[PDB]
Structures are given as structure tokens and as C-alpha cells.
Amino acid sequence: LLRPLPADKQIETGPFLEAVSHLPPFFDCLGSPVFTPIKADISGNITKIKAVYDTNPTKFRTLQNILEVEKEMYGAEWPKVGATLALMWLKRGLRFIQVFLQSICDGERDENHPNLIRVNATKAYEMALKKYHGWIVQKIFQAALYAAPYKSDFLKALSKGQNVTEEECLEKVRLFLVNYTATIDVIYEMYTRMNAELNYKV
């Protein structure tokens, strides 16, 4: 579980990185090397932010501090720089996971293929990432789509710490999603507020 959102909405950088660093392992249980480009990217961005944070944990105590400090540091180059840029991309990967898990938890599915998760992944992709990807990168994500595991296999990979029903697994995901969604929401709101959001395509 992520930390509760402080009432002032200031996300502590350390505990944030700690929490999100638990996410990339879940990719390794999707049953294909076709997810390693996606995992490497999310892990890559967590590593970049931690790197900046570790240089001055006090100065970078909160995510907002990162943006404020780097803006001061890099001037006109900001926000296309440093941990700000890493977190701009990270939040999109985190949002993908959020939408994807929420979609599954909400019972959204293709009635023709109730044991696939392609509709959930496509939805998450369209909502979180697609607008920032050119066709080269989109092909990489479509490959991940057709390699996506069966829903039953995925939910076993989330649980199967053993003796947990699929409904109980979904209950635990629903709980995780509460603070996770709020955190991601606040990060997006901050990027917009601070004019840190860039819309270039990769």
C-alpha cells in the first residue's frame, strides 16, 4: 500500500519511490519477455528520480520540491530535465497501471473473451500513454497487448501466495487502488499546476 495522502497533498519522495519500486516485479509475472521494455522504462524512471533525490534528500523531500528545485536549477530548460522529466513519464506508467487495475476490478471485459485482459490494457493504454507515443513505440505496446496473459493467469500472478480466491485478490487490488489513485491524481494535478507537463511524442 502507498502512504495515505497528506492533507496538504505533499508527496514525500523517499516513501513514494519505496512504494512504486514494488511495482516493476509484478511485470516479471506476466509470462513474456515482451514486457521487459515496459518494465525497464518504469524502473529506469524510478532510478532517475532516486538518483536526484539521493544527492540531497532534504532539498528533494517532496515531489513538489523536486519540481521547484529543478526549475530553479535548470532555468529555461526545465521541465525537460532531470527527475522532473523522469517523473513526468513515470506518472504516465503509474496511471496506466491504475487504469488497467481499476478496469479489471470494475469487471470491465470483452464478453467474447472474458478470460483475456486486452480490453483493460487497451483502455489503460489509450487513457494514459497512447497520446505520447508515435507509431514506432505504439507497435511495441501492441506486441505487449497480444502477449498479455490470461486474466486467470494474471490474477494468479498477483496472488497465488496461495489460497486466495479471484474475488479476494480483486478486493486486495481495490484496496491498493485507493491511495495509489489519489497519489497519481495529485502528481498529475501538480504537473499541470506547475506547468511541468510536456506533450511531445516519443
**What is the CATH number for 78?**
1.10.3520.10
d(CA 150, CA 22): 22
In a domain, 52, yes or no: yes
Resolution in A: 1.8
From CA 133, how far away is CA 43, in angstroms rounded?
Answer: 18
Residue 43 known to bind ligand: yes
Is 22 annotated to bind a ligand? Reply is no
- Residue 47's nearest CA partner among 24, 69, 80 is 24
The amino acid present at 104, given as its one-letter code, is: I
CA distance 176 to 157: 16
| Residue 5, in any domain of the structure | no
In a domain, 155, yes or no: yes
48 labelled as ligand-binding? Answer: yes
Q: Residue 136, annotated ligand binder?
A: no
13 annotated ligand binder: no
**Is 8 labelled as part of a ligand binding site?**
no
The enclosing H or E element of 179 equals: helix 166-193
Task: Find out whether 66 and 13 touch, Cβ atoms under 8 Å.
Answer: yes
Rounded to whole angstroms, how far apart are CA atoms 6 and 79? 25
Is 84 annotated to bind a ligand? Reply is no
| Residue 40 DSSP code | H
Alpha carbon distance 196, 192 (integer Å): 6
Angle at the Cα of 97 from the Cα atoms of 142 and 55, rounded to 5 degrees: 110
Q: Is 11 annotated as a binding residue?
A: no
Residue 132 lies in a domain: yes
Task: Confirm whether 2 is domain-assigned.
Answer: no
In a domain, 202, yes or no: no
Count of the separate structural domains present in the chain: 1
Backbone angles phi, psi at 187, to 5 degrees: -60, -45
Is 45 within any annotated ligand binding site?
Answer: yes
Residue 4 belongs to a domain:
no
